[PDB]
Amino acid sequence: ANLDRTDDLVYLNVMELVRAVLELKNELSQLPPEGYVVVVKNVGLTLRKLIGSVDDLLPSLPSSSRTEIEGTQKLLNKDLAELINKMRLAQQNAVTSLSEEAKRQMLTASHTLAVDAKNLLDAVDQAKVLANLAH
After folding, report:
1. What's the CA gap between 90 and 85, in Å, rounded?
2. CATH number, domain at 56?
3. What is the C-alpha separation between 81 and 44, in angstroms, rounded?
4. If you placed Cys at 80, which of 28, 44, 120, 123 could pair as Cys (CB 3.0 to 4.6 Å)?
């Protein structure tokens, strides 16, 4: 048995992103970029919405973990900045060998949205708990 307790709602939403972004990492070699343009939305709209959940805990944390939240919530909008910019540039009507390299690169940016989230789900976990230990 396990008496798990859901207190942090920051690692909950982000969880949906890591999944929605992980599916587009394997489908890269399946469907065209025309359909991915819509996926990046549900993959990048999960962070911009969850980021507003930790912002409230920011002022409720010490001066040690903040570097993680204030440093992750800012880069969270950069992990997709290169992914999207690569979509409109990859799916574009380009007649060159690069058209192939621009397909594998875009994917390298997708995972970024997750790789930068795994550290965020645990980052806040240390800031929230500190809110209590602190006076």
Report:
1. 9
2. 1.20.120.330
3. 9
4. 44
Task: Provide the domain limits for residue 84.
Answer: 1-135
Integer-rounded Cα radius of gyration of the chain: 17
Neighbours of 75 (CB within 10 A): 13
Experimental technique: NMR
Which two tokens mark 5?
């307790």
Whether the Cβ atoms of residue 72 and residue 120 lie closer than 8 Å to each other: yes
The domain total for the chain is: 1
SS (H, E, C) 7-51: CCCHHHHHHHHHHHHHHCCCHHHCCCHHHHHHHHHHHHCCHHHHH
**What tokens were used for 21?**
């972004």
Query: In this structure, are residues 35 and 93 in contact, taking their beta carbons and an 8 Å threshold?
Result: no
- Rounded to whole angstroms, the Cα distance separating 84 from 115 reads 17
